[PDB]
């Protein structure tokens, strides 16, 4: 037929290709590195604060 | 292609626009992360209930 | 003009005069040719309409409508061929003659120059049609379709000749439409209603209102082999246009009583399409379409104010094809399986793959996808008939819903697994099956490119 | 092209350049590129036929009719004389449709020409536009007889109401 | 490698045809494509003057 | 600016080529999908170009092309709109569908 | 709501004398498959319940009809009734809208269509 | 809405401003607060509710935006100070519930 | 070309046992409660003797149900009774006749009153009386 290139599993938990996961894991950085600049430099709110308009005079 | 064109996307699209409106930009406390404030315990109630 | 009646009557001894079986191809060959003549001098004006003779202006009028009438003839012999090959040639020579004998008057009518050539030629059919229904029927219920087809059509069209002879000697001469340049109005009385009612009701009994249509499915359910004259009887009906020649004038100013013809056919339009959903016989199912979005023109015509005639003309020849072609499908699929019962045929679409896209493009033009003629023929209806009163958007807005469940349920009934017991249905649609089923969708959609050739004067 | 005063438009006002900056602009690597893959296969061919077309020059003329027929002609019951008195009136109702077309497109040139202001400019079209159509459906529009177009029989019997009512019955005038 | 005219028979046939229907065209229609204004900024004839 | 609109329609006229050439174009065999899948790829980079042209000078466009029937007064022909919802979205809706097939 | 639909009821043991309710049907599915399995058929089966399904439904009523019970004179409440109503709705409009078109002008002057 | 007198040109969507449109104004502070030049206000492309205060200021914001094209940031202090123009305005307009509170109380 | 006595004739009764089953066996024994009875409320020509009706409802259910075919595909020889609404109808649900949807669809109708109020955030409620003042109350300057 087509080919044998991988056999199935009886729940012996098949093996990976070893370039399958590493090539992916470099994209586990792109969320954890690109999350860098969140708190640097930005705070929970970069706003300025309303100073309670006391001068009703 | 997507996940790469995902993360960078939101900032590229947004960063380049002629601004069409005025957002308030003065956001007092307790109105602020009030969404994030809810999700924080969502995950709490996610796993605790799972 | 004689450019037309003379060759098409010259057809008449092109047929019998011939030999044995060469007959069909002999006349189908020529009968196409006349279509060059059909356009030939036609599709002149335009403005200040064409009248080339004393008693004929062929069609100027911007009701061209005649080119189709000359189509459907050599669509019959491709259509009618199936089971008519089983009886004698001197009878087969007949059925081609009377069928022409129809085609000769529909060229005479639509021109007529006047009222009184119209009528005697408006009643001049029913000699050729009635003879095709009663002979070469199928069931034995046909014999009653013979009567019902008369005793309506003729029943109230005699009050024409009482009225049109009443006008001829009242105001000048009706000899010519193109002179109405003197017309006085019709104000009111208990006499004039009748005049307006006599000059009208004869036409209604052809294009049905929701009353007095009791004949229409009686004749179509049981009717000749191919729909051989059933394609023609879907030309005949819409040819009640002449109400466009009258009600534009000749008692213009009574709209007073229009309302019993509005609210009577306007609530039937939402109606008889809905009594079409549970039908168990397929050539019935199509016969009730033909009422519905035909009967919408009767609320297009009565209202004045063009943008209706923009949209009322496109409809007479809108289903003129789509409603024609469906009777051509349901014929074919009946050749193979001899019940007309809709249930029985299921599990097709595997076994006749090419005829898949034939159902679809048909059932898609009742849906009226926007680009084709169908909507651009409906959306000039809704635009004026909205201005009449805003509330018309509801009912005729419902029409645009029930008709969609209406059409699909006919297709989607033929998508199922059925292998079931049929050893029949082998023939994979020999060319005529798919040839005559074309020459509809090709010419139909095509017109949308330059659709200024289907329009009224307004 | 066309006739200037038939289709007037305001002038160009080309924007000034503002480089201001030390960084490369890619359009100058395209408008300098795209131009060179266009003009050759394009402009040479239009020049190619337009001289190839110098070999023959046809003619089609500008069709202008002859107006004797009037509106007050002639007999009451008449046919010949009142056959034409529509041909005057029918063409002159096919004109007055299109003069609404031309004046309408000129309106659009008040918007996307500008579109930011849409209000403080143009001075003309809208304040004129609704002074145009109000000069349209009155007396030039036979309604609701528009189905019959009621040519010249009803055309002057709005305008009898526009006479036998206005200017006299107005009370007091 | 080439397989360099397949992309050319693809795009380069239309790009020719489509523009030949434009260069000969835009000035034919009395009002064709509607392109908007330049949106001029005080970099031409103007002073600022603020900055305030 | 002359190339401004003209390149948009490229995106539009292209995708009709995968249809016309299904009926005796001497069709590409199976991997007919690839015939389309590349017929996509060049459309996105085609649409990528005018995106930048707008985010400089603005200047949206429409087209006047082709007169369909003109009834009483209103004259409907056809057009296209280059507007702010047109410039950004369209590259996106093609960009995903680039990856989807 | 529509309906219980009585998935349990009384039983047991009465009407266990009721048998051969299946003998009615078991006869046919024996005979039907005795019909349906044959080498040479190539065609549909009579299936009378369908013949008596339409023909006792479409036709065979106006023959059976009698114009008597005033629940068959009901239809005046159905057929004619709302058809008068739609006249009552309209004829008020087309007038209320007409009166204003004369005295006073509701529309604008940029309406040429109509 | 300070000067309520007529409009020579009738152009609404207030291409006829009172003079320049304020939010409300003045009443006293500031009697004439002063905005920007109208001749340049709609000479550029300026949306409504871009005609409020800090028109002079925000017209410069986009100036540099158009300067560096291939860039995600121009001035994050100006956009910050754009509040310092606007926040200062808005807070100056938080004072209208202070006056009316104690002014419309007893006296 | 079925010759004589094709369909129902003038019932409901002539010899209820004569019909089912002479031909057209709706009932076996002439009482299955399938006897050609169900001419309930006659004088309506509708459904004459009819080896037919009120046999029960809610669907052919289209499942294993596999003597041969038995429901909507495969066509057992002759049972046919009433049909044509049977391809858009099924059987018993889990709950029964609880309209809690009209409850929930009116659940928000409680918050109709929440419409008559506003949501203005700044300032708070601060129970007041004559403190409201949406725009102005007292003098301008
Ligand atoms: C015209 C409008 C075209 C667009 C609507 C049609 C959609 C494409 C289509 O036909 O699908 C057929 C496809 C057939 O399904 P099937 O029953 O499994 O196939 C059975 C057979 O293989 C038979 O079905 P098929 O899928 O094989 O269709 C036959 C088709 C298949 O081969 C094709 O070339 C594909 C055709 C698709 C484009 C057709 C031309 C587009 C212009 O072969 C041909 O095209 C013959 C050449 C015709 C050239 C015509 C040139 C102009 C005249 O789907 C349909 O039945 C429905 C089509 C309608 C789609 C919705 C239309 C409204 C939206
Ligand atoms: C093997 C190669 C050997 C060398 C071959 C030679 C080179 C290739 C052939 C030449 C290229 C022809 C291309 C035609 C389409 C593009 C034409 C165009 O865009 O420019 C307009 C171009 C002329 O431009 P123009 O002279 O400046 O315009 C003068 C008028 O003002 C025009 O204004 P208008 O008032 O007449 O309005 C035009 C409008 C309106 O005309 C219509 O098409 C409506 C048609 C509806 C008829 C209604 C009656 C139905 C009963 O046309 C359309 O709607 C576009 C439809 C596309 C063609 C129509 C096909 C009809 C069948 O062509 C035409 O307008 C006339 C076309 C007439 C139909 C030709 C049918 C040819 C069929 C050949 C098929 C080729 C086989 C393909 C094999 C691959 C299959 C997978
Ligand atoms: C019903 C029969 C009642 C008809 C009343 C008499 C008709 C009549 O008098 O016509 C009115 C008028 C001709 O009579 P007159 O008023 O004297 O004309 C003036 C001449 N200087 O003007 C006319 O000429 C009208 C004459 C044509 C009217 C003939 C048709 C009237 C009845 C048509 C019924 C419509 C369908 C109903 C029948 C179908 C079912 C059988």
Swiss-Prot record, chain B:
The chain crosses the membrane at residues 2-22, 27-47. It is found in: Mitochondrion inner membrane. It comes from the Eukaryota. Core subunit of respiratory chain NADH dehydrogenase (Complex I) which is composed of 45 different subunits. Belongs to the complex I subunit 5 family. Core subunit of the mitochondrial membrane respiratory chain NADH dehydrogenase (Complex I) which catalyzes electron transfer from NADH through the respiratory chain, using ubiquinone as an electron acceptor. Essential for the catalytic activity and assembly of complex I. This is NADH-ubiquinone oxidoreductase chain 5. The gene is MT-ND5.
Curated annotation (Swiss-Prot), chain D:
Pfam families: NDUFB10. The modification Phosphoserine is found at residue 148. Its main location: mitochondrion. It is a peripheral membrane protein. It comes from the Eukaryota. It is found in: Mitochondrion inner membrane. Disulfide bonds: none annotated. One of its GO terms (cellular component) is mitochondrial inner membrane. Residues 1-24 are annotated as: Disordered. Keywords: Electron transport, Membrane, Mitochondrion, Mitochondrion inner membrane, Phosphoprotein, Respiratory chain, Transport. InterPro entries: NADH_UbQ_OxRdtase_su10, NDUFB10. Residues 1-12 have a biased composition (Basic and acidic residues). PANTHER family: NADH DEHYDROGENASE [UBIQUINONE] 1 BETA SUBCOMPLEX SUBUNIT 10, NADH-UBIQUINONE OXIDOREDUCTASE PDSW SUBUNIT. Complex I is composed of 45 different subunits. Interacts with CHCHD4. Belongs to the complex I NDUFB10 subunit family. Accessory subunit that is involved in the functional assembly of the mitochondrial respiratory chain complex I. Complex I has an NADH dehydrogenase activity with ubiquinone as an immediate electron acceptor and mediates the transfer of electrons from NADH to the respiratory chain. This is NADH dehydrogenase [ubiquinone] 1 beta subcomplex subunit 10. The gene is NDUFB10.
Swiss-Prot record, chain E:
This is NADH dehydrogenase [ubiquinone] 1 beta subcomplex subunit 6. It comes from Bos taurus. Belongs to the complex I NDUFB6 subunit family. Accessory subunit of the mitochondrial membrane respiratory chain NADH dehydrogenase (Complex I), that is believed not to be involved in catalysis. Complex I functions in the transfer of electrons from NADH to the respiratory chain. The immediate electron acceptor for the enzyme is believed to be ubiquinone. The keyword Hydrolase does not apply. The chain crosses the membrane at residues 1-22. Complex I is composed of 45 different subunits. It is found in: Mitochondrion inner membrane. Signal peptide: none annotated. GO terms for cellular component: mitochondrial inner membrane; mitochondrion; respiratory chain complex I. It comes from the Eukaryota. Keywords: Acetylation, Electron transport, Membrane, Mitochondrion, Mitochondrion inner membrane, Respiratory chain, Transmembrane, Transmembrane helix, Transport. GO terms for biological process: mitochondrial ATP synthesis coupled electron transport; mitochondrial electron transport, NADH to ubiquinone.
Swiss-Prot record, chain I:
Keywords: Electron transport, Membrane, Mitochondrion, Mitochondrion inner membrane, Respiratory chain, Transit peptide, Transmembrane, Transmembrane helix, Transport. The chain crosses the membrane at residues 105-125. Its main location: mitochondrion. One of its GO terms (cellular component) is respiratory chain complex I. It is found in: Mitochondrion inner membrane. It is a single-pass membrane protein. It comes from the Eukaryota. One of its GO terms (biological process) is mitochondrial electron transport, NADH to ubiquinone. Belongs to the complex I NDUFB8 subunit family. Complex I is composed of 45 different subunits. Accessory subunit of the mitochondrial membrane respiratory chain NADH dehydrogenase (Complex I), that is believed not to be involved in catalysis. Complex I functions in the transfer of electrons from NADH to the respiratory chain. The immediate electron acceptor for the enzyme is believed to be ubiquinone. This is NADH dehydrogenase [ubiquinone] 1 beta subcomplex subunit 8, mitochondrial. The lineage of its organism: Eukaryota, Metazoa, Chordata, Craniata, Vertebrata. The gene is NDUFB8. The chain holds residues 29 to 169 of 186 of the full protein.
């Amino acid at each position: 037929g087509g080919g044998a290139h991988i056999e199935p599993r009886y729940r012996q938990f098949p093996q990976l290709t070893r370039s399958q996961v590493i090539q992916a894991e470099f994209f586990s950085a792109t969320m954890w590195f690109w999350i860098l600049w969140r708190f640097w430099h930005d705070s929970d709110a970069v706003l300025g604060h309303f100073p309670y308009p006391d001068p009703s005079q | 292609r997507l996940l790469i064109g995902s993360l960078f996307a939101g900032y590229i699209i947004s960063n380049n626009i002629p601004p069409t409106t005025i957002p308030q930009m003065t956001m007092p406390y307790y109105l602020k992360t009030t969404a994030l404030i809810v999700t924080i315990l969502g995950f709490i109630l996610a796993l605790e209930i799972s | 003009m004689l450019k037309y009646i003379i060759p098409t009557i010259m057809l008449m001894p092109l047929t019998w005069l011939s030999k044995n079986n060469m007959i069909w191809v002999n006349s189908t060959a020529h009968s196409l040719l006349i279509s060059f003549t059909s356009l030939l001098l036609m599709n002149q004006f335009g403005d200040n309409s064409l009248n080339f003779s004393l008693l004929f202006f062929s069609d100027s009028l911007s009701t061209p409508l005649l080119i189709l009438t000359m189509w459907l003839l050599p669509l019959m012999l491709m259509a009618s061929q199936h089971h008519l090959s089983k009886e004698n040639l001197t009878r087969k020579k007949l059925f081609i003659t009377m069928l022409i004998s129809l085609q000769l008057f529909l060229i005479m009518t639509f021109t007529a120059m006047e009222l009184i050539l119209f009528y005697i030629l408006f009643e001049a059919t029913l000699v050729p049609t009635l003879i095709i229904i009663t002979r070469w029927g199928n069931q034995t219920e046909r014999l009653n379709a013979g009567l019902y087809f008369l005793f309506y059509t003729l029943a109230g069209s005699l009050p024409l000749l009482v009225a049109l002879i009443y006008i001829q000697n009242t105001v000048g001469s009706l000899n010519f439409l193109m002179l109405q340049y003197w017309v006085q109005p019709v104000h009111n009385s208990w006499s004039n209603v009748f005049m307006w009612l006599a000059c009208m009701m004869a036409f209604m009994v052809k294009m049905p209102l929701y009353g007095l249509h009791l004949w229409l499915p009686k004749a179509h359910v049981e009717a000749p082999i191919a729909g051989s004259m059933v394609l023609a009887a879907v030309l005949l009906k819409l040819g009640g246009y002449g109400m466009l020649r009258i009600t534009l004038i000749l008692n213009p100013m009574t709209d007073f009583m229009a309302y019993p013809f509005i609210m009577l056919s306007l609530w039937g339009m939402i109606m008889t399409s809905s009594i079409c959903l549970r039908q168990t016989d397929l050539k019935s199912l199509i016969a009730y379409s033909s009422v519905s979005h035909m009967a919408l023109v009767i609320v297009a015509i009565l209202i004045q104010t063009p943008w209706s005639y923009m949209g009322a003309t496109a409809l007479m020849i809108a289903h003129g094809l789509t409603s024609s072609m469906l009777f051509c499908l349901a014929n074919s699929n009946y050749e193979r399986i001899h019940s007309r019962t809709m249930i029985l045929a299921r599990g097709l679409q595997t076994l006749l793959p090419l005829m898949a896209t034939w159902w679809l493009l048909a059932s898609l033009t009742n849906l009226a996808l926007p680009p084709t003629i169908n909507l651009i023929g409906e959306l000039f209806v809704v635009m004026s008939t909205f201005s009449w009163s805003n509330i018309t958007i509801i009912l005729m807005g419902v029409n645009m819903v029930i008709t969609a469940l209406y059409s699909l349920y006919m297709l989607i009934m033929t998508q199922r697994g059925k292998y079931t017991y049929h050893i029949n249905n082998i023939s994979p649609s020999f060319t005529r099956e798919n040839a005559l089923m074309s020459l509809h969708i090709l010419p139909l959609l095509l017109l949308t490119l330059n659709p200024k050739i289907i329009l009224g004067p307004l | 092209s066309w006739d200037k005063d038939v289709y007037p438009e305001p002038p160009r006002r080309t924007p000034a350049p503002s480089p201001q900056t030390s960084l490369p602009n890619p359009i100058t690597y395209l408008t300098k590129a795209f131009d060179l893959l266009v003009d050759r296969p394009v402009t040479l061919v239009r020049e190619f036929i337009e001289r190839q077309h110098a070999k023959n020059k046809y003619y089609y003329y500008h069709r202008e009719f002859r107006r004797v027929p009037d509106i007050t002609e002639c007999q009451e019951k008449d046919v010949l004389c009142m056959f034409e008195a529509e041909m005057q009136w029918r063409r002159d109702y096919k004109v007055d449709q299109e003069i609404v077309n031309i004046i309408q497109e000129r309106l659009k040139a008040c918007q996307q020409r500008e579109g930011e202001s849409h209000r403080q400019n143009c001075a003309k079209e809208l304040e004129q536009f609704t002074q145009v159509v109000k000069a349209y459906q009155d007396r030039y529009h036979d309604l609701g007889a528009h189905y019959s177009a009621r040519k010249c029989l009803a055309k002057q019997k709005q305008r009898m109401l526009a006479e036998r009512k206005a200017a006299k019955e107005a009370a007091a005038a | 490698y080439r397989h360099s005219i397949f992309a050319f028979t693809h795009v380069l046939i239309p790009v020719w045809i489509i523009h030949y229907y434009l260069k000969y065209h835009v000035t034919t229609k009395p009002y064709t494509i509607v392109e908007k204004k330049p949106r001029i900024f005080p970099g031409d004839t103007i002073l600022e003057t603020g900055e305030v | 600016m002359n190339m401004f609109s003209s390149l948009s329609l490229v995106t539009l006229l292209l995708l009709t080529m995968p249809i016309m050439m299904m009926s005796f174009n001497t069709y590409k065999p199976s991997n007919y999908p690839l015939y389309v899948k590349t017929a996509i790829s060049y459309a996105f980079i085609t649409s990528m170009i005018p995106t930048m042209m707008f985010i400089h000078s603005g200047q949206e466009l429409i087209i006047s092309n082709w007169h369909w029937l003109t009834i009483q007064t209103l004259k409907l022909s056809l057009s296209f709109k280059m507007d702010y919802f047109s410039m950004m979205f369209i590259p996106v809706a093609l960009f995903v569908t680039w990856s989807i097939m | 709501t529509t309906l219980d639909p009585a998935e349990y009821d009384i039983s047991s043991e009465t009407r266990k004398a009721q048998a051969e309710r299946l003998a009615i049907r078991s006869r046919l599915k024996r005979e039907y498959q005795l019909q349906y399995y044959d080498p040479s058929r190539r065609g549909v089966i009579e299936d009378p319940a369908l013949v008596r399904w339409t023909y006792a439904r479409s036709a065979n009523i106006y023959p059976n009809f009698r114009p008597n019970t005033k629940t068959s004179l009901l239809g005046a409440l159905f057929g004619i009734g709302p058809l008068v109503f739609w006249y009552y709705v309209f004829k008020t409009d087309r007038d209320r809208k007409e009166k204003l078109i004369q005295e006073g002008k509701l529309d604008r002057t940029f309406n040429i269509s109509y | 809405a300070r000067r309520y007198l007529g409009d020579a040109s009738v152009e609404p969507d207030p291409l006829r401003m009172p003079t320049f449109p304020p939010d409300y104004g003045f009443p006293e502070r500031k009697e004439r607060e002063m905005v920007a030049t109208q001749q340049e206000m709609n000479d550029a492309q300026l949306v409504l509710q871009q005609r409020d205060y800090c028109a002079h200021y925000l017209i410069r914001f986009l100036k540099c935006k158009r300067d560096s094209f291939p860039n995600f940031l121009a001035c994050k202090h100006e956009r910050h100070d754009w509040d310092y123009c606007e926040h200062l305005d808005y807070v100056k307009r938080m004072k209208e519930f202070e006056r009316e509170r104690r002014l419309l109380q007893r006296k | 070309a079925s010759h004589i006595t094709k369909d129902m004739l003038p019932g409901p009764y002539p010899k209820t046992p004569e019909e089912r089953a002479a031909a057209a066996k709706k009932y076996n024994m002439r009482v299955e409660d399938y006897e050609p009875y169900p001419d309930d409320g006659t004088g309506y020509g509708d459904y004459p003797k009819l080896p037919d009706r009120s046999q029960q409802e809610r669907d052919p259910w289209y499942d294993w149900d596999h003597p041969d075919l038995r429901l909507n595909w495969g066509e057992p020889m002759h049972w046919d009774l009433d049909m044509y609404i049977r391809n858009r109808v099924d059987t018993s649900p889990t709950p029964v006749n609880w309209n809690l949807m009209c409850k929930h669809l009116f659940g928000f109708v409680a918050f109709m009153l929440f419409m008559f109020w506003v949501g203005e955030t700044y300032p708070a409620y601060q129970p007041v009386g004559p403190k409201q003042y949406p725009y102005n109350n007292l003098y301008l300057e």
